[PDB]
Design an enzyme around this catalytic site. Structure first.
Site, PDB file in Angstrom:
ATOM      1  CG  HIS A  54      -1.841  -1.147   1.301  1.00 21.57           C
ATOM      2  ND1 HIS A  54      -1.433  -2.469   1.359  1.00 21.57           N
ATOM      3  CD2 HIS A  54      -3.192  -1.167   1.366  1.00 21.57           C
ATOM      4  CE1 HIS A  54      -2.494  -3.249   1.433  1.00 21.57           C
ATOM      5  NE2 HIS A  54      -3.574  -2.484   1.442  1.00 21.57           N
ATOM      6  CB  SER A  82       6.921   3.585   2.919  1.00 21.39           C
ATOM      7  OG  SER A  82       5.773   3.339   2.096  1.00 21.39           O
ATOM      8  CG  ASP A 113       1.589   1.826   5.982  1.00 25.61           C
ATOM      9  OD1 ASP A 113       0.871   1.847   6.995  1.00 25.61           O
ATOM     10  OD2 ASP A 113       2.105   2.841   5.483  1.00 25.61           O
TER      11      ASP A 113
END
Ligand SMILES: Nc1ncnc2c1ncn2[C@@H]1O[C@H](CSCC[C@H](N)C(=O)O)[C@@H](O)[C@H]1O
Ligand SMILES: Nc1ncnc2c1ncn2[C@@H]1O[C@H](COP(=O)(O)O)[C@@H](O)[C@H]1O
Ligand code: NA
EC number: 2.1.1.266
Length: 280
Positions: free
Chosen positions: A42, A100, A164
């Site tokens: 994600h 991320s 995530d």
């Protein structure tokens, strides 16, 4: 249907914890010369504008990354992460926060690769643009949970899998566990990092029970709460559940969690802990 916008939360205390753990695992993986895969189920938009209306409405980054990125006594364990944040704010004003995928993009080496998915029709095109000029990455508009089947094991046979989700759909609490089980079946030596919110403690306890029932061993839990558990609306805490953590991670977290909690939570409420859900 995909109404969640990470911009509201980007750079908050949960992101600080999540990205601290992500960066430390990546640095461990880089110790061996062999290539590895970074798989982000994600992935989000890649980067976030903290001056946006969404970010300023909550102001959550002000109580997160803002409280640590310019500290002079920054623990060594945070240097790799904070240096990425500084790269995106070279004016010294806090205006952008790397998600991320961008932390991964700047920490990975030439031989490493990234596989990123995002379903949102605003965030996927933004994520695509971040990686147009980087052949190490593959970015797809598809279900992240499906990637735990489609992309594992990597040919390199080494990797970090960040899971995530936003938990907008409550099925996420089951899907992360079933998804980890499928990925682990295909790639048992992978490092799996699962982020979770504490909105309702009982949801998390049930999730952890389900995870234990997979029979998977070596499961580390890292949690930072800014407030004690409550039945009220909000998220009072978040954590990272790490399967096959690198051998240093527990000690590194013991080294930095007290400092982090002192900076993110000046009032000293909540807690910060690292413990094993399943040992050995
Ligand atoms: N099934 C799914 N597959 C892929 N992305 C999903 C998904 N369900 C929700 N999403 C996306 O998942 C994201 C969670 S927030 C992701 C933040 C990112 N990992 C970071 O640390 O910066 C949202 O952007 C949402 O659009
Ligand atoms: N990443 C996050 N960081 C902080 N709070 C969040 C995050 N995701 C969800 N929340 C909060 O969790 C609560 C429950 O979500 P919802 O039921 O979708 O409103 C709301 O107060 C959200 O703002
Ligand atoms: Na989230």
């Amino acid at each position: 249907m995909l109404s969640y916008r990470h911009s509201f939360h980007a750079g908050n205390h949960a992101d600080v914890l999540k990205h601290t753990v992500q960066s430390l695992i990546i640095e461990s993986l880089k110790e061996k010369d062999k290539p590895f895969l970074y798989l982000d189920t994600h992935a989000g938009a890649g980067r976030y504008q903290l001056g946006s209306e969404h970010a300023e409405r909550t102001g959550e980054y002000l109580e997160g990354i803002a409280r640590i990125w310019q500290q002079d006594d920054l623990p060594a364990e945070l240097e790799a992460y904070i240096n990425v944040v500084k790269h995106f704010n070279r004016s010294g004003q806090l205006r952008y926060y790397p998600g991320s995928p961008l932390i991964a993009r700047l920490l990975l080496r030439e031989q490493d690769s990234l596989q990123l998915t995002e379903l949102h029709p605003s965030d996927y095109p933004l994520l695509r643009s971040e990686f147009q000029k980087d052949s190490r990455a593959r970015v797809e508009k598809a279900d992240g949970f499906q990637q735990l089947k489609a992309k594992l094991p990597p040919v390199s046979r080494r990797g970090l899998i960040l899971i995530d989700p936003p938990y907008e759909m409550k099925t996420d609490y089951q899907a992360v566990v079933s998804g980890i089980a499928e990925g682990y079946k295909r790639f048992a030596t992978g490092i799996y990092a699962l982020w979770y919110p504490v909105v309702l403690r009982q949801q998390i306890k049930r999730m952890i029970h389900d995870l234990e029932a997979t029979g998977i061993r070596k499961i580390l839990q890292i949690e930072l709460a800014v407030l004690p558990d409550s039945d009220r609306r909000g998220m009072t805490a978040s954590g990272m559940i790490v399967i096959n953590p690198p051998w240093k991670l527990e000690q590194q977290m013991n080294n930095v969690l007290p400092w982090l909690h002192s900076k993110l939570v000046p009032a000293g409420t909540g807690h910060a802990t690292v413990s094993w859900i399943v040992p050995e």
